[PDB]
């Protein structure tokens, strides 16, 4: 249960760290001093990754009016938002040190209509704040992945955000439990044998 929970956290940190990887690619594109055209070309490619936990995401430059490059995977570039400058995820990252990542709570996107978590980071150009990159992670994609991984280790699992919020619950009585906090983000798993 101990080592088995450690190997589960390892296998669950893969899509999360790869969410950071994509987000770092978004930041580089925002810092690239690129015209909107080429940017659309590259952002469609980056999201063209097959499957995964990411459902949508894009770039959100400082207003002044609005020029957000948002994309969703159903890939179709979205139109609305153009404001996003007053959105929780936007503000948490506005004019923050480049390289910091902010995980939002679980919420329902009004536009795309998906239960998700929004990780946000700022990108800079010429030592000036330029915008915010975001990556939206589908809760259903994260749930099926964690459920299939734990069940393959013959375990029940309860993963929680740093918010201590029940993100997923799978097969979780006199029983032993293992609490494993992992990652720069303060997520934890509660694991039993199933």
Residue numbers in the entry: 46 to 109, 118 to 127, 132 to 139, 145 to 234, 238 to 259
Task: Provide text from the study.
Because purified CqsRp contains ethanolamine derived from the E. coli overexpression host, to obtain an apo, i.e., ligand-free, structure, we generated CqsRp-D198N. Based on the CqsRp-ethanolamine structure described above, we hypothesized that substituting Asp198 for Asn would disrupt Asp198 hydrogen bonding with ethanolamine without disrupting protein folding. LC-MS/MS analysis of CqsRp-D198N showed that it contains less than 2.1 ± 0.2 μM ethanolamine in a 103.3 μM sample of protein, and we then determined the X-ray crystal structure of apo CqsRp-D198N to 2.50 Å resolution. Since substituting negatively charged Asp198 for uncharged Asn resulted in a dramatic reduction in CqsRp-ethanolamine binding affinity as determined by LC-MS/MS and the absence of ethanolamine in the crystal structure, we conclude that the Asp198 negative charge is critical for ethanolamine coordination. Importantly, ethanolamine, L-alaninol, and serinol did not bind CqsRp-D198N. In addition, while the CqsRp-D198N crystallographic asymmetric unit was dimeric, the protomers were anti-parallel, which is inconsistent with a biological arrangement. In contrast, CqsR-D198N was completely irresponsive to ethanolamine. The interactions mediated by the platform residue are essential, as substitution with Asn resulted in the loss of in vitro binding and signal detection in V. cholerae. Ethanolamine binding to the membrane distal Cache domain triggers its compaction, and the residues corresponding to helices α3 and α4 become ordered.
The canonical V. cholerae quorum sensing circuit is controlled by four histidine kinases CqsR, CqsS, LuxPQ, and VpsS. CqsR, however, is regulated by ethanolamine, which is produced by V. cholerae and the host. As anticipated based on sequence analysis, our structural studies confirmed that CqsRp is a double Cache domain, which is the most common extracellular ligand-binding domain in bacterial receptors, including, among others, histidine kinases, methyl-accepting chemotaxis proteins, phosphatases, cyclases, and phosphodiesterases.
